Design a protein around this ligand. Structure first.
Ligand code: FES
Ligand code: FES
Lengths: 121, 121
């Protein structure tokens, strides 16, 4: 899996090769590659690792894979996904807000944006 | 170079490799890979091949490489880039609108979005 990390704090985006499976978190891949996604609880509660994920390959409108902890945090910040109908109707490729500590690294390519501030602030 | 093509007309994004040593425009890569970016003039005049490019690796904020023809088309559709300072200051990785027939593929990875309608309508 190829992951491109991007942040206002990084003058260059960082391309990372990540081996799929392993139950590796997206935050774990970032931490292993020195990409400073903010984090605290590492457990889907504090919301620090909020990232904006664009799926580069695979389905244009992917089925939603958020954990229940994600859904509570994302609701609290207004970053819950729109439905597949709304997402399919837009002209721009819809990103998905996720918590990086809750996102499992699979065999797909991602662009992962984060502001560098805790909570995606 | 790896180019992910994405469009509402594409149920999956298409991961394409643009090969080394081949001088190609982005439109040429799309045409060779069956990616249905609209085109007509293939010469930067008609605006048909307007795409929204996200630079996946390399610099976060691009020095603009627009041709004079692109600048005219982009001015006409209101898609000229903002200043680099403005682009650097926003939270979301700014894409660049370009004409695919004017964009020379180099050794960088791109996400290339297009609506499927001429001019990106
Ligand atoms: S670090 Fe608390 S939500 Fe991921
Ligand atoms: S095909 Fe006419 S501007 Fe590119």
């Amino acid at each position: 899996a190829t992951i491109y990390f991007s942040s206002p704090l990084m003058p260059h985006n960082k391309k990372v090769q990540a081996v799929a499976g392993k139950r590796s978190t997206l935050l774990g891949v970032a931490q292993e590659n020195g990409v400073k996604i903010p984090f605290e609880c590492q457990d889907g509660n504090c919301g620090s690792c909020l990232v904006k994920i664009t799926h580069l390959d695979g389905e244009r409108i992917k089925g939603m894979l958020l954990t229940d902890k994600e859904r509570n945090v994302l609701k609290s910040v207004g970053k819950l996904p729109k439905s597949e109908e709304e997402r399919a109707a837009v002209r721009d490729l819809p990103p998905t807000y996720r918590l990086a500590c809750q996102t499992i690294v699979t065999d797909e390519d991602l662009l992962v944006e984060f502001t560098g501030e805790p909570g995606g602030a």
